């Protein structure tokens, strides 16, 4: 019955948006540009140790207007796309809905072990599918988030060469390291890393390395251990790539901090033929670089092999364990609360049975292989960011504001028409922030923006959507964060102590970065038209919709002309329109603030606002009504102009403009 | 509802233009007469080492008037077309536009890879039988700029022939160089090319010449690396030519300014299933003229064979690369700026996937075997850049004059006839001088401007228009060339930075070269009619013409008398209205002066404009309005006779005079 | 809607094409004449060793004329149809089209092996059709390509009795070579075997001859190697022919060049459950002529059983072995663009699972056996390259030229009516010849010869025609051969170095030999009339057809009297016919010399050509175009007389005439 949803919902299915595919083909071969620290500038030699977390590779964009038919020259500006580059939280959460993790069929690993064991003649007790069914689930999630934080530390050490380095290898084993020295690729305040050099557990009997061992008998008992059981062949158990695998994915677990670490076990237990190889703990530098990338190879085919050959959920997961190092910045003033609402992944203990004789599938272009795996990782978080940002704002920019006199007077008290009646929160600033969590929920379950979010994650994803939709669903169901009223200043990474307070206490909740990188990369854009090319402004209509409530960001004639012209090309005069008693004009700011227009004036003595080129806030909500305004022109007939736009980003896409919109 | 328009358009159908073929055809096999530095004559005997960047290739045309009536005869005036052929520039910048740069389609290179990877590749990797994760970008752009680069060295080379030669690989690679000097040729104060001899890269293991190899065998591994894959058969890889042609594109690739070299990185690599032949890295005197010339052949092969035959875009980026070295030069003392503002062709770092087993096709004549290429792709640029012209001034001159103390909101104040509203700007003189892409776009949106020009280009190339279209457009988009108050004095490439100054402050931004040439190359030109016979020409009528809005060079009846006798001929004087009121009239020329007429007089000492001969500026607007005028005749007859004129040039193309136009009848 | 095609394939299926047996069983017993030297005459007594890379066995067949009611006597001319003999190329090429290269289906095979390894109680993992399927598939087409070259260099060593031979083995494994010395069968310029005595491999622990062995134990572990496994039953492990057949195969493996033992490795390893018979690398002659005849045959028996059973790739695959040693020659000036663009095919390394327990199927009449295997392989390439010269020849005679005006005018310049507008190609000589391969690719993909020559071969062999026509689109399609513009001389092999340009330096790409031999043998024959029996001429409209572009070998009366008439039985005279200005009629040679007919004057004043009593050039492309011309018979009606033709090739089949044609 909503017009408006079933126009949008048409349009999307007309042109359909850019498949994942693109977006991850664009960025396998990026050669990020520069390093330098998100505030200031590049010490001329770099540290011996990651300390300063506040580094970020900047992938730089740039843009810049041009007024046909007039001789101003408009300072090109900068799309700073900030990607967070050391800086350590946490993305792991036992909370699942009901969708939102899986349970992958052991339907085609059980019938192969089967055969195993009678062919080896081994005694074993009860059929193995009901054992299988009951005692030890298939749930090997956890395999790939720490393969996944592996690659990251590798990124991360790479990117940022600290003067002397030593391996991928000995900068995670912790080899000469103080007993209360941090890990040197990770030494900072605040940091998620245990210290100290890892200890390697006792040898005991049977090892296959820092794992358990059993070996099947011909005529012998044979019984299974409690954790996950990773049944293979002879050759392999003596292959030294294998066993460096399992070593690196043993030191990467035991670093991750003390209290997850009696969570989340890393339990699993190596069954053959062979004869139990034992523990060979590499001590000294004995990890060459080949050698690591070999085991990184087996690492990842093994980990295929236990996926049912799937690369696309094991890739999903692979990703989300490395935005616990690489996390996408935000390009406001008040950031922080789109990303620290969805990053979270249900998840349960590693625990079944696997098989692995030998690859099946050949993956042309896995993750660890890409030019640099952080970057890679980080943009599709931003692109998932990116549609939930498109859909939040979809009826407005729901603010949420800080007024003393909350309790007095309800809501729409001071929004005009501007912010959609229903989309404005406020609260008393006696009592702490309120949570996030909140307002999110109630968000995302309205009809409207679920029925949509569904159709622009499946067009994106596919035939693996549901996952993704779940578990965003449960993360942003589960967030502790709160609205602090305090500031950013977009020239940090971590909120400053001291911040000044926000513009007018009000927050908006639905940014999170331009939508011209949506536009660009060719997925799902909110109601903001796409700066392109070629455009044909009219001040004065525009001016007058501005007025209305919209976002000056749609006004392209206004920004252009910010501060070149509007002094000498247009005035505002009070209606004088009927016979009826006058009235002066006058229109609302944000923050309440009646301002009265009594005097006709030159429009740059009655309003102001930074000039940004044409990159301005997109929802920043200027003028929320105005009633009795009437505008003029004191030009001849030069109000009317043409104007140039050119962006000219390095991660433009395939699908360059051909996403759908709301307001073509 | 434009009757302008649509006449055009149909005459445009009526007499088709000619398609380039035919200027190909032309030019293709002749050598130059003689080649000099712009500004002077050449020395006894050349230097080392090309360092004076003025030496331009001329191509020398005449125009003769005769006539019977006039005093005393005509001079001829000599209208000859320049090549730059020494200054460099870029070409090459990263923005783009729905059409300005393709991706190719990997339809018959999948087929092959996959069967190749699939049986030859150890049996424990897993079989691949997916055909659908080879799907990388195919952007095989960069090669053929690089490729005709290096063809504009040679060429280059060859037309200043210096004192002492060098081996062509010599002079590329230099091994016998300074800690930074520049390369033997490309050494002057404009050049751009990384100094210093080049630094072969490795002695890695597997090895192929200048770039990376990976095999696909039983007892090894398998991972395709991450830029460009050429998957070639064992046979070839092993073979000669072929190396010497990578080798040579790789030296050409790390002469590029570095900063430019690293934004587009030379990535190519390959991979084949043979052991990996070592890099030879040619040194000394390994590489000569016909090894040079074959690996030349390979190369062509190999990059045809990579475009999926197409052979018209491979072309068309060879051209485009050829084009930094080469290019005309402009003839009017206004700057000659139009080129640089449709120079630039979009880019993006090459990738792809590539197989090549032979030829599928063979081309009778490319481009880099025709007797210098330089010249070719020279006037191959030059025939678009007329044909833009011609489409810029369909309206009017299009002026950009300097007034003190104007406007800093609007700069757009009405000239008079001659001039429609929409053009004719004007600027303050002491701030920064304007942008120069803030008039162009707006000059080619508009639905005149733009459907004489799809059309025009689509006659001249066919099929594979849209192409240089869009890029073109694209080009004026971001175009950082700004107007500027000084003169290139007929006889520089670059404007001497002194103090040349404009006769009238002002600025003719439409016009690039004298648009006989347009009309001898038989592509579209406009305003200006051509003048290559006998004429009948009525000077009392033709003058009348001028005054209100004309341009002389349309006036071929006066330039002829200009100073032969023009005088004792007509008399202008104010209106003879016989009734309301005898009011006085004047003229106002291109300045701001606005000198009255009062009596009969005559004209020479009225307007007393420069004498060229039959070759005056075409878009200069030598009066703007005049009111109050009558050009009475003061001899019977003698203002009613004939006039032959006649051009000979040496490019003459096969259509000459066949083709479209839409100037005064 | 294309008329002339639709004829030609209604009277191909009115007219059935010769099956390939008749073909064969007409060459089984063959006995060749003539083992004279291509160019010169065999000297008195033998060499003893194979240099001179020019001998030729000649299968000399004669044709002589009668002219009927006349008393001339024209000498009997002679259908050279030569056999090179003694010369080395290579037809392997590791690149396929999608039905290039099959894969043997290995549905017999991998069950009895499973019942075998259950019956001996051997301990294996993992079922073994999967780990058929994906780590071993089943290509033996290799073991059968080294076969071919075996039974190839026996028979070139028979044929040539090197004046004092040692044996099929003494002279294959170079015993008493020196180090730099090439083998006793190949040694001259440009050969193509590797040199030296062969060197056999260490003796390791288990080894079944040249190549490695393992048995399998009851109760106790089984690992298979890399390469291909051929199970037997004990019984065969233990005979002399089995090992004998394996050491030739290795033999001859280590012998072809270096560069291709690195790529193909010859691997293969024989299980079974005897104990290691170990290497017994024969070394002093102890290889008896009896000892090799058996050991060939107990070979053959076990590439058949490996082959399915099928017997017909087997062939094929044989014979595509042997053409490295005979190949079919030319019989024109500019010859070798036909053979050498069908010769390769596209192969891939051996491997996958075999199983041999007994014979299945008797083969009655291998290619072994034959009289002279090396002149029945050459003769099926020959009908090969007859038949692809058939199709080729369908809309003209396809000539390239080398004008050096070629850039300033297009095609169709010189070439008139005579050749079809859209078949003649030209190029510049400044330039390198041009690759064949552009030429023969855009001619073989035209819809109209496609098919055509899709029926014609599966008439001619059947189902296994789609595997052969796979292979020479990819040949053809694969080739890097150049047409260089020297000529031959038809007096040699090998071009030699200085011989002179080609007539008018126009080469003709789709002559490869003389049709009357595609006639006699009841293949497919292009349009060109078969000079059979009784003939019935009319030199008038004979004559004038010629001069509109026709063949002269379709004109029999002029070439019956090219030198004994056409002196007084024939005039030249322009056409008089209207009353409008008289015109010297004229007529254009292939090399565009216009010439003038001003004066009438007798045929053989105005026109020449060397007289080859009735077998002309074919194609030659004589005239090109003539206009304005009369011709007045100048004789008391004799100029109709008959013609008598008799051609007693001694390679005549079954269906002698009753071949499909053109213009019949």
Same mark, same amino acid.
């Given at each position: ?15 359909? %948006?850019?498949?994942?595919?693109? !977006? ?23 540290? &011996? ?17 041009? /007024? ?10 900068? /799309?700073?796309?900030? !990607?967070?580059?050391?800086? @350590? ?5 036992? $909370? ?20 195993? !064991?009678?062919? #080896? ?60 020295? &941090? ?26 390395? +820092?794992?358990?061992? *059993? ?13 996950? %059981? ?8 003596? @292959?030294?790539? #294998? ?48 050698? *690591? ?22 890739? =999903?997961?692979? &990703? ?62 931003? *692109? ?25 007077? @309800? ?23 309120? +949570? ?10 309205? +009809?409207?923006?679920?029925?949509? #979010? ?29 609205? *602090?009223?305090?500031?950013? &200043? ?5 909120? +400053? ?21 949506? =536009? $660009? ?15 044909? =402004? ?65 429009? @740059? ?15 920043? %909500? ?31 896409? %395939? ?10």
């Amino acid at each position: 019955s909503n017009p408006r949803l079933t126009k949008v919902l048409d349009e999307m299915s007309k042109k359909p %948006c850019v498949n994942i595919n693109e !977006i991850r083909k664009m960025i396998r071969n990026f050669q990020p540009q520069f390093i330098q620290p998100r505030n200031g500038n590049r010490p001329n030699a770099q540290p &011996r140790t990651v300390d300063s977390f506040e580094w970020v590779v900047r992938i730089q964009s740039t843009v810049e207007t041009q /007024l046909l038919g007039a001789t101003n020259t408009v300072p090109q500006q900068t /799309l700073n796309l900030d !990607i967070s580059f050391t800086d @350590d939280s946490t993305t792991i959460t036992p $909370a699942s809905i009901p969708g939102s993790i899986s349970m992958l069929d052991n339907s085609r690993h059980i019938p192969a072990i089967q055969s195993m !064991i009678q062919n #080896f003649k081994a005694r074993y007790l009860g059929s193995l599918q009901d054992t299988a069914q009951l005692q030890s689930p298939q749930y090997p999630q956890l395999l790939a988030y720490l393969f996944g934080q592996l690659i990251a530390i590798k990124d991360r050490l790479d990117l940022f060469r600290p003067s002397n380095p030593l391996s991928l290898a000995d900068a995670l084993f912790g080899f000469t390291l103080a007993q209360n020295a &941090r890990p040197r690729y990770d030494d900072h305040r605040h940091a998620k890393a245990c210290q100290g050099p890892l200890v390697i557990p006792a040898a005991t009997n049977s090892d296959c390395g +820092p794992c358990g061992f *059993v070996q099947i008998n011909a005529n012998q008992g044979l019984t299974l251990p409690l954790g996950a %059981c990773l049944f293979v062949n002879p050759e392999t158990v003596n @292959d030294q790539s #294998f066993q460096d695998f399992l070593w690196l994915i043993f030191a990467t677990h035991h670093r991750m901090p003390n209290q997850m670490q009696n969570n989340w076990p890393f339990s699993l237990n190596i069954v053959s033929t062979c004869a139990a190889p034992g523990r060979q703990a590499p001590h000294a530098g004995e990890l060459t670089d080949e050698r *690591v990338r070999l085991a990184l190879d087996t690492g990842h085919r093994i980990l295929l092999s236990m996926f049912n050959d799937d690369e696309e959920t094991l890739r =999903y997961y692979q &990703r989300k364990g490395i935005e616990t190092m690489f996390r996408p910045c935000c390009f406001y003033t008040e950031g922080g609360l789109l990303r620290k609402a969805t990053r979270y992944v249900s998840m349960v203990p590693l625990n079944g049975l696997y098989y692995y004789n030998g690859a099946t599938s050949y993956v042309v272009s896995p993750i660890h292989t890409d030019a640099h795996p952080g970057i890679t990782a980080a943009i599709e978080s931003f *692109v998932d960011i990116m549609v939930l940002q498109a859909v939040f704002s979809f009826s407005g920019p729901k603010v949420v504001a800080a007024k003393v006199n909350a309790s007095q007077i @309800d809501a729409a008290m001071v929004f005009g028409p501007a912010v959609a009646e229903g989309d404005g929160f406020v609260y008393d600033p006696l009592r702490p922030a309120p +949570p996030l969590s909140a307002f999110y929920t109630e968000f995302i379950h309205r +009809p409207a923006e679920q029925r949509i #979010f569904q159709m622009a994650m499946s067009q994106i994803y596919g035939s693996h959507a549901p996952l993704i939709i779940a578990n965003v669903i449960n993360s942003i169901h589960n967030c502790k964060t709160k609205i *602090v009223n305090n500031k950013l &200043r977009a020239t940090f990474v971590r909120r +400053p102590p001291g911040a000044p307070h926000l513009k007018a206490d009000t927050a908006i909740i639905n940014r999170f970065h331009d939508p011209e990188l949506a =536009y $660009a990369l060719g997925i799902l854009a909110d109601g903001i038209a796409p700066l392109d090319g070629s455009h044909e =402004y009219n001040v004065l209509d525009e001016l007058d919709y501005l007025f209305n409530g919209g976002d000056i960001r749609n006004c392209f004639g206004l920004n252009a002309l910010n501060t070149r012209g509007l002094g000498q090309i247009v005035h505002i005069r009070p209606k004088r329109e009927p016979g009826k008693r006058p009235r002066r004009g006058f229109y609302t700011t944000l923050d309440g603030q009646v301002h009265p227009v009594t005097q006709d004036a030159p429009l @740059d003595e009655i309003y102001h606002w930074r000039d940004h080129g044409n990159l301005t806030r997109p929802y920043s %909500c200027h003028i929320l009504d105005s009633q009795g305004l009437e505008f003029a022109d004191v030009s001849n007939g030069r109000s009317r102009g043409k104007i140039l736009v050119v962006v000219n980003s390095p991660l433009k896409t %395939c699908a360059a403009y051909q996403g759908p919109s709301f307001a073509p």
